[PDB]
Design an enzyme around this catalytic site. Sequence first.
Site, PDB file in Angstrom:
ATOM      1  N   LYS A  96     -22.591  81.889 -13.479  1.00  0.00           N
ATOM      2  CA  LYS A  96     -21.653  81.070 -14.263  1.00  0.00           C
ATOM      3  C   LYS A  96     -21.849  80.957 -15.763  1.00  0.00           C
ATOM      4  CE  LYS A  96     -20.327  77.452 -10.907  1.00  0.00           C
ATOM      5  NZ  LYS A  96     -19.725  76.089 -10.961  1.00  0.00           N
ATOM      6  N   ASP A 148     -13.709  74.151 -12.084  1.00  0.00           N
ATOM      7  CA  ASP A 148     -14.511  73.075 -11.510  1.00  0.00           C
ATOM      8  C   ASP A 148     -14.108  71.749 -12.149  1.00  0.00           C
ATOM      9  OD1 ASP A 148     -16.278  74.407  -9.642  1.00  0.00           O
ATOM     10  OD2 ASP A 148     -17.361  75.230 -11.370  1.00  0.00           O
ATOM     11  N   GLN A 163     -34.644  65.061 -21.663  1.00  0.00           N
ATOM     12  CA  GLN A 163     -34.106  65.860 -22.759  1.00  0.00           C
ATOM     13  C   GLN A 163     -32.711  66.397 -22.471  1.00  0.00           C
ATOM     14  OE1 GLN A 163     -35.748  69.753 -23.575  1.00  0.00           O
ATOM     15  NE2 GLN A 163     -35.243  69.657 -25.758  1.00  0.00           N
ATOM     16  N   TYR A 213     -22.364  69.736  -0.286  1.00  0.00           N
ATOM     17  CA  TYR A 213     -21.663  69.599   0.993  1.00  0.00           C
ATOM     18  C   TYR A 213     -22.426  70.174   2.184  1.00  0.00           C
ATOM     19  CZ  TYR A 213     -20.128  74.104  -0.907  1.00  0.00           C
ATOM     20  OH  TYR A 213     -20.109  75.338  -1.506  1.00  0.00           O
TER      21      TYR A 213
HETATM   22  N1  LIG Z   1     -18.483  70.894  -4.391  1.00  0.00           N
HETATM   23  C1  LIG Z   1     -18.305  71.830  -5.357  1.00  0.00           C
HETATM   24  O1  LIG Z   1     -17.265  72.479  -5.512  1.00  0.00           O
HETATM   25  C2  LIG Z   1     -19.485  72.046  -6.300  1.00  0.00           C
HETATM   26  C3  LIG Z   1     -19.256  72.600  -7.617  1.00  0.00           C
HETATM   27  C4  LIG Z   1     -20.368  72.794  -8.480  1.00  0.00           C
HETATM   28  C5  LIG Z   1     -21.663  72.477  -8.067  1.00  0.00           C
HETATM   29  N2  LIG Z   1     -21.864  71.926  -6.766  1.00  0.00           N
HETATM   30  C6  LIG Z   1     -23.219  71.557  -6.210  1.00  0.00           C
HETATM   31  O2  LIG Z   1     -23.902  70.609  -7.015  1.00  0.00           O
HETATM   32  C7  LIG Z   1     -25.264  71.079  -7.279  1.00  0.00           C
HETATM   33  C8  LIG Z   1     -25.488  71.508  -8.706  1.00  0.00           C
HETATM   34  O3  LIG Z   1     -25.093  72.866  -8.950  1.00  0.00           O
HETATM   35  P1  LIG Z   1     -25.212  73.501 -10.400  1.00  0.00           P
HETATM   36  O4  LIG Z   1     -24.389  74.750 -10.529  1.00  0.00           O
HETATM   37  O5  LIG Z   1     -24.944  72.424 -11.403  1.00  0.00           O
HETATM   38  O6  LIG Z   1     -26.708  73.947 -10.598  1.00  0.00           O
HETATM   39  P2  LIG Z   1     -28.301  73.661 -10.819  1.00  0.00           P
HETATM   40  O7  LIG Z   1     -28.416  74.177 -12.171  1.00  0.00           O
HETATM   41  O8  LIG Z   1     -29.079  74.528  -9.820  1.00  0.00           O
HETATM   42  O9  LIG Z   1     -28.800  72.093 -10.851  1.00  0.00           O
HETATM   43  C9  LIG Z   1     -29.860  71.916 -11.988  1.00  0.00           C
HETATM   44  C10 LIG Z   1     -29.737  70.325 -11.939  1.00  0.00           C
HETATM   45  O10 LIG Z   1     -30.085  69.777 -10.559  1.00  0.00           O
HETATM   46  C11 LIG Z   1     -31.181  68.742 -10.867  1.00  0.00           C
HETATM   47  N3  LIG Z   1     -32.264  68.730  -9.833  1.00  0.00           N
HETATM   48  C12 LIG Z   1     -32.811  69.818  -9.201  1.00  0.00           C
HETATM   49  N4  LIG Z   1     -33.832  69.530  -8.379  1.00  0.00           N
HETATM   50  C13 LIG Z   1     -34.022  68.198  -8.533  1.00  0.00           C
HETATM   51  C14 LIG Z   1     -35.005  67.315  -7.956  1.00  0.00           C
HETATM   52  N5  LIG Z   1     -35.889  67.683  -7.023  1.00  0.00           N
HETATM   53  N6  LIG Z   1     -34.940  65.995  -8.365  1.00  0.00           N
HETATM   54  C15 LIG Z   1     -34.052  65.569  -9.307  1.00  0.00           C
HETATM   55  N7  LIG Z   1     -33.107  66.354  -9.948  1.00  0.00           N
HETATM   56  C16 LIG Z   1     -33.122  67.685  -9.505  1.00  0.00           C
HETATM   57  C17 LIG Z   1     -31.633  69.234 -12.227  1.00  0.00           C
HETATM   58  O11 LIG Z   1     -32.564  68.487 -12.926  1.00  0.00           O
HETATM   59  P3  LIG Z   1     -33.459  69.202 -14.095  1.00  0.00           P
HETATM   60  O12 LIG Z   1     -32.532  69.554 -15.232  1.00  0.00           O
HETATM   61  O13 LIG Z   1     -34.492  68.144 -14.383  1.00  0.00           O
HETATM   62  O14 LIG Z   1     -34.039  70.431 -13.436  1.00  0.00           O
HETATM   63  C18 LIG Z   1     -30.323  69.425 -12.915  1.00  0.00           C
HETATM   64  O15 LIG Z   1     -29.622  68.320 -13.362  1.00  0.00           O
HETATM   65  C19 LIG Z   1     -25.518  72.112  -6.145  1.00  0.00           C
HETATM   66  O16 LIG Z   1     -26.080  71.553  -4.988  1.00  0.00           O
HETATM   67  C20 LIG Z   1     -24.143  72.730  -5.968  1.00  0.00           C
HETATM   68  O17 LIG Z   1     -24.018  73.288  -4.663  1.00  0.00           O
HETATM   69  C21 LIG Z   1     -20.785  71.746  -5.926  1.00  0.00           C
END
Ligand SMILES: NC(=O)c1ccc[n+]([C@@H]2O[C@H](COP(=O)([O-])OP(=O)(O)OC[C@H]3O[C@@H](n4cnc5c(N)ncnc54)[C@H](OP(=O)(O)O)[C@@H]3O)[C@@H](O)[C@H]2O)c1
EC number: 1.1.1.25
Lengths: 262, 263
Positions: free
Chosen positions: A64, A100, A150, A207
């Site tokens: 992305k 999104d 940060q 989900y």
């Molecule tokens: N339903 C939908 O259509 C949809 C759309 C987009 C995303 N999502 C979902 O939402 C999530 C995020 O996806 P993404 O693309 O944004 O990518 P991502 O980059 O992999 O998420 C990085 C982020 O998740 C946090 N995080 C990770 N492990 C953590 C932990 N153990 N404790 C606390 N915070 C933690 C990170 O904190 P740090 O910055 O501190 O690492 C940060 O804010 C995924 O599970 C994805 O499947 C769903």
Amino acid sequence: MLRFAVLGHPVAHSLSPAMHAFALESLGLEGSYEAWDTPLEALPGRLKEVRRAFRGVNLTLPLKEAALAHLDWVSPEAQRIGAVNTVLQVEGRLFGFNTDAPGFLEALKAGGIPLKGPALVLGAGGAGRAVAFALREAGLEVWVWNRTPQRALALAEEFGLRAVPLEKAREARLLVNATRVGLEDPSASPLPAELFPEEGAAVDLVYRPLWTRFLREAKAKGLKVQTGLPMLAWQGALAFRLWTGLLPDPSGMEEAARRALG
Amino acid sequence: MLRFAVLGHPVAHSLSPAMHAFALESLGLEGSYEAWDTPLEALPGRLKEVRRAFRGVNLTLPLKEAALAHLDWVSPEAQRIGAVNTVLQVEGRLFGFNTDAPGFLEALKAGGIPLKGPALVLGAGGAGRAVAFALREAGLEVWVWNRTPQRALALAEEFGLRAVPLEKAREARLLVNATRVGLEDPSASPLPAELFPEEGAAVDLVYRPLWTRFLREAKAKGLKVQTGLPMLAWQGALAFRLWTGLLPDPSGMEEAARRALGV
Ligand SMILES: NC(=O)c1ccc[n+]([C@@H]2O[C@H](COP(=O)([O-])OP(=O)(O)OC[C@H]3O[C@@H](n4cnc5c(N)ncnc54)[C@H](OP(=O)(O)O)[C@@H]3O)[C@@H](O)[C@H]2O)c1
């Protein structure tokens, strides 16, 4: 005609193929939407390939953000968010968009979740940025938190929002989990139970499982809840329109995604 | 519903409405393609209505040039040609392309005419530019002529071509009439029979009448010929593919135009 696909790694269990198969069928169109694994280093090659034989594709983790320096054009929103999840191919040229952000808003409306702030977005990562962008556009007061301060502070500055501590969750009226916490882990939630407000709404982008610990805690507190399927469906529906000019039924795509999960 | 239109001044005789009506129907899609008279004054107000209520539109004179500055993105080819005939609307944004250049090439290919050069384009105006552009990218040698020598030499430089005298037509293997000569003038042609190539093929972009004096002359001489309808059909089919991702049958597009022409 109409060759589509989702690129990312992993994508082995993406629900898009099922949703889009339904979109094509429902609209009486012939075509295919296939899941095609693609590392963040095999991207340059695939965008070239997309150019020669795909009408469009969805981008997912972790392509992305890197796809932008690879498209002939990127929408103002996709650029601000810094991530593209939908690519359209015409005459071999590639255009990047982000469905999104708008998809999330349509999901909330369709699901009857009131746009009432302050809205707290948990996670300043990719999904968090898209959701924060959407909620800001909708005119709500938006707060952001991140395990690593940060990133939350930087995003708050960048988008003109406010980085807050987890405790402020009690004063939020719309809670959104945009972190990966809870993914395939029913025992984990990004927010301690005791910090959930007692009125408002909660949405989880995760989900898998469908009813995450986060949503169960929220429902237990009497908050209106929405799973990650509606957003997934709407971002997909909007992507389909970008590609064809036709808007497949979002409720239908969601159901199709559900059936596909088991 | 899919909303399309052809914008220009005039457009009352455009064959696009008939062609795209066939595209929509044959592809089992619901929508419409209307002709919307649009004088240059009104391009701005018109484009805004496009960003809002149309999936895409075709542009015809006199809006093909003044459109680029108003679009969010213009294709390279359309940039170099300096004209846009196809506009796509997505998320309120407008993108411009030129389906004439590739449509011209695909019509030749589908019609048999080999891209065997040297090829000579008669006319350095809007029509000639699109064609001259398409032919080199295709990979053959290209000469250009124009009644006003200047407009030709300048094009040979801007596009990396070669301006030649009308006599050169004899040494060409691909002749293309990009002039308005012959338009509703059965006995008029821009090229004297005596200057017609020895071997080769000729294509006329004028389709009213369908069999111009130019094409009749070319044929009498033994050259393969193609009317202007195949190009019209392909630029239209390519435009439709551009808007929806589906390519309507170019042969069917041509038939629809033929019927609309009544010949
Ligand atoms: N339903 C939908 O259509 C949809 C759309 C987009 C995303 N999502 C979902 O939402 C999530 C995020 O996806 P993404 O693309 O944004 O990518 P991502 O980059 O992999 O998420 C990085 C982020 O998740 C946090 N995080 C990770 N492990 C953590 C932990 N153990 N404790 C606390 N915070 C933690 C990170 O904190 P740090 O910055 O501190 O690492 C940060 O804010 C995924 O599970 C994805 O499947 C769903």
